[PDB]
Amino acid sequence: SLSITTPEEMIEKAKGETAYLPCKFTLSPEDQGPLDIEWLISPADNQKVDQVIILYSGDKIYDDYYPDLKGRVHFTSNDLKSGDASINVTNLQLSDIGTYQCKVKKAPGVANKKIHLVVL
Amino acid sequence: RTLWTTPDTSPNCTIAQDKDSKLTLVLTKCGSQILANVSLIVVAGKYHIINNKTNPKIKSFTIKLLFNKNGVLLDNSNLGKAYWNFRSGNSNVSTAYEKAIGFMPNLVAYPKPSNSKKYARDIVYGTIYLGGKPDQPAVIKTTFNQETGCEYSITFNFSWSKTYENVEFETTSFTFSYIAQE
Ligand SMILES: CC(=O)N[C@H]1[C@H]([C@H](O)[C@H](O)CO)O[C@@](O)(C(=O)O)C[C@@H]1O
Ligand SMILES: [Ca+2]
């Protein structure tokens, strides 16, 4: 079935640097639907629901979401549809620490990955 | 000379959580080729016990070794620095090395990603066996100089196709070589 490499991952990077958050996926032959990528963050406030970061949908990028990351998050691949939904986060702050989720869908295929990001 | 993790490392690798694995890696310099020997024991966390009946989508994970211009291992590598060093007996020399460019994967042989796709020759594939059982293959895919945020890199990807049920992820050993930077 549809799967993502290293579906739970811990990443550490230093303050001011750029984090590379990998989301490399493998499709199955049955996955003939439209490709849909969603990244989310779990806020440090545990009483707040997850927030959308960035989307790839209908071959377009939508990034007008989580304000703390606005302008700092981008898809890294020049060919995302070939299996690379990775993003980077520029100028890391200590407040960027948290759990990030990549959701890859191509109906009926679905997979998700969680990254625990630590900033030192 | 030999640059290594030692042959019986304490947990030295962080994949899903801190110190969840033991990567054994021995690099021995034979002039312009490095002779390499590798294995993995996962000791805790997501990848420790594989159960694809309960977790059908856990099929692949990656360990990255990132090096600076001096061949020094970077902090954000999955492999930890403390016991990655030149050998002394069955352990390491006491002081951290400052230079190991002669052990780095050659950048002309294996260039970083660019407008050019990396050729397949920048990869070596091997099959290892979980728990030493012949019916429990997994693939180790090793790529040279794939990664960003470093001068050099060695990436180890571990993957499998079979539906493993309660199989501990600890592998047989695999030997390969690569072209040295100098
Ligand atoms: C060491 C080795 O070569 N193992 C191979 C085995 C053995 O030949 C048989 O299990 C023994 O009967 O066969 C496979 O098809 C398997 O079981 O997945 C492929 C695997 O690579
Ligand atoms: Ca939470």
Numbering used by the authors:
A (entry chain B): 19 to 138
B (entry chain A): 184 to 365
Publication excerpt:
To date, all Ads display a characteristic, icosahedral symmetry in which 240 subunits of the trimeric hexon protein form the facets and 12 copies of the penton, comprising the pentameric penton base protein and the externally projecting trimeric fiber, form the vertices. At least in vitro and for most cell types, the fiber mediates the initial attachment to primary receptors, such as the D1 domain of the coxsackievirus and adenovirus receptor (CAR), sialic acids, CD46, and others (for review see Zhang & Bergelson). Our results showing that the CAV-2 fiber head contains a sialic acid binding site creates a paradox: both HAd37 and CAV-2 fiber heads contain CAR and sialic acid binding sites - but HAd37 uses sialic acid and CD46, while CAV-2 uses CAR (CAV-2 does not use CD46 to infect cells, unpublished data) to infect cells. We show by structural analysis that the CAV-2 fiber head also contains a sialic acid binding site, but in contrast to HAd37 this site is modestly involved in hemagglutination.
